[PDB]
Amino acid sequence: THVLRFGGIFEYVESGPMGAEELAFRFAVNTINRNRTLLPNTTLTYDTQKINLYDSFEASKKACDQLSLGVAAIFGPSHSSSANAVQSICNALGVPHIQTRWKHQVSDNKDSFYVSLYPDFSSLSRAILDLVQFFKWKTVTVVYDDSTGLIRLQELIKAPSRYNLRLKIRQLPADTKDAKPLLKEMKRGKEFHVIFDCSHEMAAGILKQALAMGMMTEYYHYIFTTLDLFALDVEPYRYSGVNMTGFRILNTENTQVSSIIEKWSMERLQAPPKPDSGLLDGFMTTDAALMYDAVHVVSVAVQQFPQMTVSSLQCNRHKPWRFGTRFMSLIKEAHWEGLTGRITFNKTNGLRTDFDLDVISLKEEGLEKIGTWDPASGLNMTESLSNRSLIVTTILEEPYVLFKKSDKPLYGNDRFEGYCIDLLRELSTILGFTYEIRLVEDGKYGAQDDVNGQWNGMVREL
Amino acid sequence: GVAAIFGPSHSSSANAVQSICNALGVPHIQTRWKHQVSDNKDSFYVSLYPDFSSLSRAILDLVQFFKWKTVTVVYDDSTGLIRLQELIKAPSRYNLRLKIR
Ligand SMILES: *[C@@H]1O[C@H](CO)[C@@H](O)[C@H](O)[C@H]1NC(C)=O
């Protein structure tokens, strides 16, 4: 019957047969035609090209070769430099471009034949800012890997102008995995709250060098802007008392999504993750999820456009596609729900700015969901007793309270004696008390320090 | 028969022309600053615009000479943060109070 095929330009690799994005694309294309509910009388076909993702020339060449034959839409590369050429080609030839990864769009680029499935960092940075403000942070150390990281998290970077945050922007060393010098610089600077704008594998890298260095104590809270935090192997960090936090768009809390991800993991049995990499196994990266969702949303959109006589557009001469405008508007207005939750494209942009997030933080188990984030509503973090110990504190004033003169080691309340201890015993035998003496760590009386408006010792402990 | 392409003064078009020139081997002479991704291996291109990796530190030297403790970096477009990224990272190595706008 009627048939249309989708163009696809992905990474050219040799160790693995083909990239994870291509895996997801092929999996979903052979899922659409197999699932008779979606595209019942039309079979989806995949046209796959492999490039270096950095040679925009060969990306343009492959896009032109695909457009020479019948292509309804191009699933462009997952880079920020070869995707611009492909979207320009698609716009000039009037064919939808399908971006599953974030790239910096020029403010004066009047291009409207592309859709960006990746959640816009214009909203993800606001989500990071809301997560920081919820934790009431004051010293925040934004860490990014690529120079485009500042462009990604620019709302977070501009936040100190509005809020009271103190930002110390740092960059991971380039062309090397030596994250130890940067963590050392944090240790000298006593930077405890960190925001990591690095990929999940790189995030696992810095987590490993942080554990090997001493960053995995209780006083370190890590916010990861990456959406693949659930793919990390937090087992070495599970019981370390670390407060690492992140987000997640891959809606794993669903039966259909669980079945899809389990099928994808079962299909992924040829390139297992490296055991000594700090990463999980049998999972699905967010890039594959966005590719799956992209091809699915294009399929559900083209469900409403039965006339799909793909043309033979050339690049030597420019000729807009007769079905390109309506198909592109249909893609932009298309509303589908899948692996990454609700998929709604911004009308004025084509990017996806209205997305549903789930907040992920480290707990006693591995990365439980502790809230949700929506661009409209905002951050939604949901996460006496008679037989209760009465914690008390005291200072070592010799006439008042002093350690009992017993050579035999003694613990609990009995190890403390003095006039104040006698008064506490009298109160306990007068009232109902089950009390334990907890010595003050600061070892001082309360003092209103005008330097920062902070108390200390017993008063602050109270 | 052209010996060198004096490509466009815009990031996307300059990147496209630079990739084409690198593929075909002809030099691509660009006179405007554009963000070259780190892993890019294009060789047939030279940029005459003063590298903001070396000019943002000139701005930082000016700030040091004036002994500023609080600075407000104001930029226009989103690719302005990636231009003066050394100036943004400076507060780590110095004593500044950047209030980027
Ligand atoms: C937050 O999430 C809880 C649980 O899903 C829900 O009951 C509540 O209505 C949500 N609040 C907002 C403001 O979305």
Curated annotation (Swiss-Prot), chain B:
PTM remark: Sumoylation mediates kainate receptor-mediated endocytosis and regulates synaptic transmission. Sumoylation is enhanced by PIAS3 and desumoylated by SENP1. Ubiquitinated. Ubiquitination regulates the GRIK2 levels at the synapse by leading kainate receptor degradation through proteasome.
Localization in the cell: Cell membrane; Postsynaptic cell membrane
Protein origin, superkingdom: Eukaryota
Expression by tissue: Highest expression is found in the olfactory lobe, piriform cortex, dentate gyrus, hippocampus, granular cell layer of the cerebellum, and in caudate-putamen.
Extra remark: The postsynaptic actions of Glu are mediated by a variety of receptors that are named according to their selective agonists. This receptor binds domoate > kainate > quisqualate > glutamate. It does not bind AMPA without coexpression with GRIK5.
Protein's job: Ionotropic glutamate receptor that functions as a cation-permeable ligand-gated ion channel, gated by L-glutamate and the glutamatergic agonist kainic acid. L-glutamate acts as an excitatory neurotransmitter at many synapses in the central nervous system. Binding of the excitatory neurotransmitter L-glutamate induces a conformation change, leading to the opening of the cation channel, and thereby converts the chemical signal to an electrical impulse. The receptor then desensitizes rapidly and enters a transient inactive state, characterized by the presence of bound agonist. Independent of its ionotropic glutamate receptor activity, acts as a thermoreceptor conferring sensitivity to cold temperatures. Functions in dorsal root ganglion neurons.
Family that this chain belongs to: Belongs to the glutamate-gated ion channel (TC 1.A.10.1) family. GRIK2 subfamily.
Subunit note: Homotetramer and heterotetramer with GRIK5. Tetramers may be formed by the dimerization of dimers. Assembles into a kainate-gated homomeric channel that does not bind AMPA. Can form functional heteromeric receptors with GRIK4 and GRIK5. Can form functional heteromeric receptors with GRIK3. Interacts with DLG4. Interacts with NETO2. Interacts (via C-terminus) with KLHL17 (via kelch repeats); the interaction targets GRIK2 for degradation via ubiquitin-proteasome pathway.
Name of the molecule in the record: Glutamate receptor ionotropic, kainate 2
Species, as recorded: Rattus norvegicus
